[PDB]
Amino acid sequence: EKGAVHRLVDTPGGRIHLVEQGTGPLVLLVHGFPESWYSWRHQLPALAAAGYRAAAIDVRGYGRSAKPAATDAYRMLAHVADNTAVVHALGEETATVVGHDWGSPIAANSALLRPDVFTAVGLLSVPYAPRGEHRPTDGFARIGGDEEFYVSYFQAPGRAEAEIERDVRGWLAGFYTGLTGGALTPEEHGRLFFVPPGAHLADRFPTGPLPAWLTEADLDVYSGEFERSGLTGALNRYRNVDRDWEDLAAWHGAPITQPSLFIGGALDASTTWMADALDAYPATLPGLSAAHILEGCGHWIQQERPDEVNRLLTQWLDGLRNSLEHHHHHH
Amino acid sequence: EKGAVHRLVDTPGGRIHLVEQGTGPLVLLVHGFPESWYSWRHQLPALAAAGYRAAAIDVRGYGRSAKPAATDAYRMLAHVADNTAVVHALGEETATVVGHDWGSPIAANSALLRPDVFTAVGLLSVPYAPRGEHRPTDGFARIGGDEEFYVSYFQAPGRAEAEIERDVRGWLAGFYTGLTGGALTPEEHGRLFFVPPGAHLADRFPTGPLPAWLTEADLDVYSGEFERSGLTGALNRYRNVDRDWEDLAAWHGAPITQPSLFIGGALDASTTWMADALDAYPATLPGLSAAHILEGCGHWIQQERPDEVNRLLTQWLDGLRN
Amino acid sequence: GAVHRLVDTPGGRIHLVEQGTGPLVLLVHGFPESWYSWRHQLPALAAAGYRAAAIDVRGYGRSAKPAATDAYRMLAHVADNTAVVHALGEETATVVGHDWGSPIAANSALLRPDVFTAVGLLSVPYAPRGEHRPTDGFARIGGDEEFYVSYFQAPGRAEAEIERDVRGWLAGFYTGLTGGALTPEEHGRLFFVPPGAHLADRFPTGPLPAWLTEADLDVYSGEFERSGLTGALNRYRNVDRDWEDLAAWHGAPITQPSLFIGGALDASTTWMADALDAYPATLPGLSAAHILEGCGHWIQQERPDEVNRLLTQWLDGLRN
Amino acid sequence: GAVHRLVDTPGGRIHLVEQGTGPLVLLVHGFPESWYSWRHQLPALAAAGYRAAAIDVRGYGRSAKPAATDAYRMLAHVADNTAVVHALGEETATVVGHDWGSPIAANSALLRPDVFTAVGLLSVPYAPRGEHRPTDGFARIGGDEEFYVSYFQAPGRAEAEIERDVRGWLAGFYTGLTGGALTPEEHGRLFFVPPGAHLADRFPTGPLPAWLTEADLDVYSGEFERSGLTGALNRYRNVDRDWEDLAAWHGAPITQPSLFIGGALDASTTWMADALDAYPATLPGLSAAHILEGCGHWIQQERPDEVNRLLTQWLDGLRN
Amino acid sequence: EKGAVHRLVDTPGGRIHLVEQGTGPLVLLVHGFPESWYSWRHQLPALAAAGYRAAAIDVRGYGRSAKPAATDAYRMLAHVADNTAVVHALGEETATVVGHDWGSPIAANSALLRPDVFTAVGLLSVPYAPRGEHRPTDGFARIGGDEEFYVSYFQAPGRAEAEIERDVRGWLAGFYTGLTGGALTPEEHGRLFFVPPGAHLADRFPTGPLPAWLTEADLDVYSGEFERSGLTGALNRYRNVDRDWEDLAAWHGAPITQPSLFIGGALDASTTWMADALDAYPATLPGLSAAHILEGCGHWIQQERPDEVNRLLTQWLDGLRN
Amino acid sequence: EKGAVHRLVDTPGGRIHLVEQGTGPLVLLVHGFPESWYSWRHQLPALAAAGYRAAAIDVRGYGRSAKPAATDAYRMLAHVADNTAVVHALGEETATVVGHDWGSPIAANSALLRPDVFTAVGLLSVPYAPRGEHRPTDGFARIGGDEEFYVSYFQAPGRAEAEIERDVRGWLAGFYTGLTGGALTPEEHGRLFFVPPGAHLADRFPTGPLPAWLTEADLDVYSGEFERSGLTGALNRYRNVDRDWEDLAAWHGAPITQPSLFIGGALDASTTWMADALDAYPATLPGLSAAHILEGCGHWIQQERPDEVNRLLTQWLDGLRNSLEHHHHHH
Ligand SMILES: C[As](C)(=O)[O-]
Ligand SMILES: C[As](C)(=O)[O-]
Ligand SMILES: C[As](C)(=O)[O-]
Ligand SMILES: C[As](C)(=O)[O-]
Ligand SMILES: C[As](C)(=O)[O-]
Ligand SMILES: C[As](C)(=O)[O-]
Ligand SMILES: [Cl-]
Ligand SMILES: [Cl-]
Ligand SMILES: [Cl-]
Ligand SMILES: [Cl-]
Ligand SMILES: [Cl-]
Numbered sequence A, F: 001e002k003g004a005v006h007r008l009v010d011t012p013g014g015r016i017h018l019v020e021q022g023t024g025p026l027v028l029l030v031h032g033f034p035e036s037w038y039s040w041r042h043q044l045p046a047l048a049a050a051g052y053r054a055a056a057i058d059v060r061g062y063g064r065s066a067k068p069a070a071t072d073a074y075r076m077l078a079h080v081a082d083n084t085a086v087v088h089a090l091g092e093e094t095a096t097v098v099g100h101d102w103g104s105p106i107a108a109n110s111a112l113l114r115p116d117v118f119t120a121v122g123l124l125s126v127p128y129a130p131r132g133e134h135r136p137t138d139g140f141a142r143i144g145g146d147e148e149f150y151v152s153y154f155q156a157p158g159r160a161e162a163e164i165e166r167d168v169r170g171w172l173a174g175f176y177t178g179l180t181g182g183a184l185t186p187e188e189h190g191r192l193f194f195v196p197p198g199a200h201l202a203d204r205f206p207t208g209p210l211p212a213w214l215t216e217a218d219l220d221v222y223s224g225e226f227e228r229s230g231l232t233g234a235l236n237r238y239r240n241v242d243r244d245w246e247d248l249a250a251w252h253g254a255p256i257t258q259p260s261l262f263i264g265g266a267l268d269a270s271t272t273w274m275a276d277a278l279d280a281y282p283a284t285l286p287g288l289s290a291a292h293i294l295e296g297c298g299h300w301i302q303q304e305r306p307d308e309v310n311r312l313l314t315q316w317l318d319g320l321r322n323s324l325e326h327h328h329h330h331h
Numbered sequence B, E: 001e002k003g004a005v006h007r008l009v010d011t012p013g014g015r016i017h018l019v020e021q022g023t024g025p026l027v028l029l030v031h032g033f034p035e036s037w038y039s040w041r042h043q044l045p046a047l048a049a050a051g052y053r054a055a056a057i058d059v060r061g062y063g064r065s066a067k068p069a070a071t072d073a074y075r076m077l078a079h080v081a082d083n084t085a086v087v088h089a090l091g092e093e094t095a096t097v098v099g100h101d102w103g104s105p106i107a108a109n110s111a112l113l114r115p116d117v118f119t120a121v122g123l124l125s126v127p128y129a130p131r132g133e134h135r136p137t138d139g140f141a142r143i144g145g146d147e148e149f150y151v152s153y154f155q156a157p158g159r160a161e162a163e164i165e166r167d168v169r170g171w172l173a174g175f176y177t178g179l180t181g182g183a184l185t186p187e188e189h190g191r192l193f194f195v196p197p198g199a200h201l202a203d204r205f206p207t208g209p210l211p212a213w214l215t216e217a218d219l220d221v222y223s224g225e226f227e228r229s230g231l232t233g234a235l236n237r238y239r240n241v242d243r244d245w246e247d248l249a250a251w252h253g254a255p256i257t258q259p260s261l262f263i264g265g266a267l268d269a270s271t272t273w274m275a276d277a278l279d280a281y282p283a284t285l286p287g288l289s290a291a292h293i294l295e296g297c298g299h300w301i302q303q304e305r306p307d308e309v310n311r312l313l314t315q316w317l318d319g320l321r322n
Numbered sequence C, D: 001g002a003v004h005r006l007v008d009t010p011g012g013r014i015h016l017v018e019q020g021t022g023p024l025v026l027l028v029h030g031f032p033e034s035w036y037s038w039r040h041q042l043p044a045l046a047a048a049g050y051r052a053a054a055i056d057v058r059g060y061g062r063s064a065k066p067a068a069t070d071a072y073r074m075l076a077h078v079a080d081n082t083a084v085v086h087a088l089g090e091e092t093a094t095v096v097g098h099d100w101g102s103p104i105a106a107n108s109a110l111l112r113p114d115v116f117t118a119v120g121l122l123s124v125p126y127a128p129r130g131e132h133r134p135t136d137g138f139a140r141i142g143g144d145e146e147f148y149v150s151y152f153q154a155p156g157r158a159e160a161e162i163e164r165d166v167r168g169w170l171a172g173f174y175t176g177l178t179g180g181a182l183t184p185e186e187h188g189r190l191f192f193v194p195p196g197a198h199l200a201d202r203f204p205t206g207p208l209p210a211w212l213t214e215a216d217l218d219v220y221s222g223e224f225e226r227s228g229l230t231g232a233l234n235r236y237r238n239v240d241r242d243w244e245d246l247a248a249w250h251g252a253p254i255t256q257p258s259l260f261i262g263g264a265l266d267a268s269t270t271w272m273a274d275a276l277d278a279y280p281a282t283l284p285g286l287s288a289a290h291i292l293e294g295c296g297h298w299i300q301q302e303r304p305d306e307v308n309r310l311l312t313q314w315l316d317g318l319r320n
């Protein structure tokens, strides 16, 4: 908003747009799907006030950042190159990278592939899972039986786009609402991630009022982005899970040793469906400071619990600046 | 922005964004390349004050409107379907369509193919030329000599995009400035449209101050649209010239009989390079009220000469109403 | 008498056979037919005071057959008709189309009502452009079995079946859709292909129908043995493209005078009852909808005199 | 008299016109021609005691025209000829080919010498398969200008030129290669296309040649207005594939009795002098090589009686 | 190896590798899938001792022979051109061609298309069947039911490769073992050739000891070839069954008139699945000396029954020489 | 040969063949173009005798290693994953990687992307050049004017293969001979790397006797490999220079900090044409032990100077085990 400043920086893949606020060590924030730099609006002044230079990018394919045409231009190595060039373009040599949802694997792999640049890593909602042995799409395909796991539904180009483009604002509204903590029962919350043959993912989205974290003016911002960007850039992220599995094969099973932080929502499927990865943290994230679970919190962790995320981030950052268990938080 | 209202309407091709202002007969406004509904900001209050409902769309491929993946989804028949469905979605059965730059052939073919909907047509900068016998790319490739005509440069996917994406804001400012009336000499103006082999089109763009009609805040708006939309939807318009020439073959040499209006800039190549089209207006636009040439005006006619364009549109429109 | 002409068009060239003097009646044949399908109408129209011009549709006989599949989209057929009217020295015309020629004629009247000032539609009713993608509709019809229109979509698929014996395939198809040739049971299954089967596996065998002599079959088969069937089939392969191109006329009615003639034993008639029932709104200038008892698909050949009477009576009515 | 037949072949079907009784003489026309190019030979062969069968080559007239370009490779033409001999109830035949029919006949004799026991070659000499890729040779001929065979390689390119006016293009080509129609100067440039030009830009205009009446041109143009030119041109688009397929016969000679007839004013004759000079080794069973004075490319039509005499005299000689 | 000499000869399709031994009339040996010239190691000294020049090639796609990239470069006419040019490159005008497994149709069509070069033909394991009316893939797809016939499994590029590359040596050993006479019951033997959906062909391969004809050192040779060559050249042979059926249409139903010899294994599916082809030998191979069925012998006939195969070949060859 | 043992190991991209010899720390050797594991035959017993476990792989696309069909399966990240999986498959956690010619960028990038695995790196003939700003093929295209730089000549699939397949043994013989130290004058040596339009690269290869380092039996081994493998796998390496430039963008300008060693030949074009990269070593290889130039030595450094390479490698290794300038060596 105000105090925060928009920047356009050049990277090998092209233009990256970001909003930065504050002075001090660089904290690079990486949003998820289908989101925006604007998802960090609550973190930007808190990190700035706490003595940090926070920079929230638009991920490749999103908002005002470059959106290359080729699908493989959204492979993990491209996002990691995007982050590296942003740190350098901001005049820094190192940074803490914090990622949410798809920004979490982007942040983890940034820390994994360039540890001399990304010297600490925060992960929200999606735990770190090392590159594994099996092809992801063959895996997403076991799931569901009958119904198609939404990640498989997302693979075919133009398919999910056609569904979403029917009414972008409505589709975002349903998705934002549906994954908010407590918006759906566990049981419908789970059925939301599967698409019956011939159906649409949004057929199981709720239609009631916007959640408390999303005003109509906030939705105008989000829908205003995707009505302009389209969804292909965002969706191409999912369309590289196989390519990423090949590219990261040199880091098969590799741990992130740098200091790390995990914050997840108790009502977040991204957290509860990958509990095994989360429980492997003593081996996969040996430098983890702590794993925090926010009770009653859904998927949009840094907007559903902005003050709690702010508190945990800056406490963790400050601990690193002045130099295990699941910790569960109430409210 | 203050008076005008944003809307999203459904069309057979997907969502169309528009900004409308005023009450009365529908005047549909269609921007060109590389612009936005925002190019009509000075016309929306003027038409509204004159008793019209002005509706400025984002053309398919631009701003908040749908941007299909397929290059041929930007063929002329898609734009015309977009315009028709916009008139119907706004609750109207007829409308006047006014188009600038590429919006001009879009308005012309809207008037040509659906004369029962678009009952009068205004064309700015780009004259009406009926569908001809020659394949458009065969001509674009002929002129310029060793240098490549910019429309020909725009044909290959990703080529013009790669150039513009180097600096979307910078490219727009140069193009906006280069085509402003008097910003370049006529010689400099003419070669701006030709690309020497290995060169970039923007290599002949001027640098320095923005033209008077475009503030830095105006550039923030335009560049903010294209930093989100990309340039492919916009460029795909050029990539259908041969497809349109095929599609429009059933209206080969056909005139537009509706009442029509033409406004062009004396220093606009889009106007002065098609003098032959203007000379055929007595036959091709037999319902023409008048052809207006604005002396000293460049390409961005409704922003470079907003008051005279406003007056010409409303007086012409009122003329139809009596 | 009747005369062959080759006229220049934007897509290349249209071959046609014209007969008579007077207001121009452009005749547009269906699938898998020929200008020759109108042979009984050309002298009748000439005797009634009209200049009848029966084209070979793009892809057929002596007309241009471009290689690209989408060169057979509806807008191409319409430019073909427009250019033919102009090449014959006329400014307006009555267009009459049968089977696939019916939507070609209907869209000619719809897009250029200043040229096509009246329209005749045979066998296939007019349905305005709707919002559902045609191939999605053709899919989930049948189940299970593949609706023949879906069968026609894949390039080379129907061609490989027909080319086994162009003449035999033509005869079976002409025979199968003749009024009274099959039970309803047989008639309905003819339009569906079981997986791995051929469409013609359900074609009847035996004697040629009454409207088709052996010499008639020689003409038809002599054409397709030279042209092949791709141009004809590419017509079906543009239903989705057409649905996109015609979106600017979504739900639009045809307002100028129109005439419909269909067969009671024509599936094209009974499967599009809704379209026929919507005529008061979709064809408000409709003169009448005639359903000919016992008539199959090949209406202007199975009921040559009745079609001639209705057409010339309708035509005479317009200019009176 | 002469009779039309449709015979079944592995590639689909060959249409042909046969006349006479006796040993089978299969006639194979060139580009852009027809079975009809042999019209003066069919009665002559019948009167001399032979059953002459003039096919439409695959891609032409009423014969099958498969979609794939490589379905016009030389082995397909040879299976077509083999299947035709068998479909006509014969076990062996004499094959006589003109222009592109010459390599088709030559390779039929080469690959199935037990079926094709004698071979006639008109206009185009026999050259055994060599090791150089043909398209590489056609490239660096001319420079600078594009040899017409290279011009024929790209799909749609020659077709777009010809389809502007199939009849006019045919007439110009037939006229240009008629004996004496052009100066050497004009004749040589006809086979090269300057960049951006059309091959027919160097075709002569004016009266039809003496061998081609207006009614003759109606037949030819009536065929290609129905078939299009892709099947015919796909023949040229297989020179490289043929060069690969025929590698098992690299440098192989044709040993059974053979006959060559060429025109002195035929470029196909003068540009392949080396092939003609190598006949003692490449065609050791050669009866004679006849070069007809003043004759252009269309040898069996420009010199109908001389070709008839040489063929029947040669044929009578073999079985004596 | 000791007596035999390695050679590289030029052919129109590129380099062909072979190992030759002996002096006299040329006997060209053609291995099958997935083998090597090395499959003829027991025949090279025997033919040489009998007065013949035996030449065992690496088929195109195998070992040290050229392996073109294009799938259709493995069509039957390429193999025949390879064989012809090999005869000519070795300084001969004629030869006897003897082929095993896929080398059998290669030898048959070599004899069919160039009878002036290949004056007698031996066929092992795979009977001669003249080119028929039915598209080969239409048949392969019909049989097996819900399970997929292995030739049909081999059609898609990379599919069979991915399975085999999991463990080239292991796959070969299983296939070599599975088709050895008596290694499997006839029921197990038959389903080895069908792949249930989602399964791998090698899922039905036996494990355990190598067959008697193949030492570990022999497997090192075979696996060492395929670890370098890959399997695509070998599999591309199957990927041309429909192309060959088109290419060979000019020899539809044609018989091979040369003197011919057939040797097959009683427990070899390649032999027993084509009994109909064997029953037509009086018409299709009218120059057949005799059809030999080796009881208890499996697929790898010249290695499973080397002495009897050696005797049959040389006595047949000597029979031609008088 | 003997003492050395062949192994086949499984990697994410498939099978890697290698020959290993010795006991002690792992020294992974990576050959160049168009070579083989067999190029290290002289290093295998010397490293084994000096207390090291030397493992010479066949690079992806070569000899008995896997040769995937897709061209991009030869991107740098695949070679680096190949090396990582080989270290793990041999029961080790770290290794010294030593690469020659194309194995040198493979070894450097292995050390750059997985420094926790590859803890020291040796580079022969080809210096380390960080990922740069310009697209490689646009660069290879400036070169020559008229004549086509062989790297550009190598891009079109099937093009160089057709040339080489005309006579694989002859082509290797000419290339091996042509780049041997002192085999050609500087001037012809340079013209060898350019192809006039319509010509063949081998048209400028010498035809005399094999160089001293290559016996007829050695050439039988090399030609015996490529007559079986074909050249596409080897050439696809060159066909990924652009893809590599994208993939390594996250390491733009990045240095290798681990201990490094460079050995190059004085008569090696690979050394003299990239002198600028070699002279940037204080910044790009801050951990360089030394840069060694072997006088009179050509391209095939570890075969043209086997004892000198052995001596420099083991002295360097031993220095690391017990814990700037161009150094030029004579003979
Ligand atoms: C874990 As998600 C909602 O970005 O697919
Ligand atoms: C007609 As224009 C100069 O806007 O491309
Ligand atoms: C009703 As129909 C003969 O056009 O498929
Ligand atoms: C010599 As010709 C008519 O076949 O190009
Ligand atoms: C004929 As076979 C079993 O070797 O594919
Ligand atoms: C440096 As090199 C001979 O592998 O291209
Ligand atoms: Cl995109
Ligand atoms: Cl810090
Ligand atoms: Cl787009
Ligand atoms: Cl920028
Ligand atoms: Cl066609």
Ligand SMILES: [Cl-]
Binding pocket: D065, D066, D067, D230, D231
């Ligand atoms: Cl065709």
Ligand SMILES: [Cl-]
Binding pocket: E067, E068, E069, E232, E233
């Ligand atoms: Cl291969």
Ligand SMILES: [Cl-]
Binding pocket: E166, E167, E168, F008, F009, F010, F014, F015
């Ligand atoms: Cl393995």
Ligand SMILES: [Cl-]
Binding pocket: F067, F068, F069, F232, F233
């Ligand atoms: Cl490969």
Ligand SMILES: [Cl-]
Binding pocket: F025, F096, F317, F320, F321
């Ligand atoms: Cl060490």
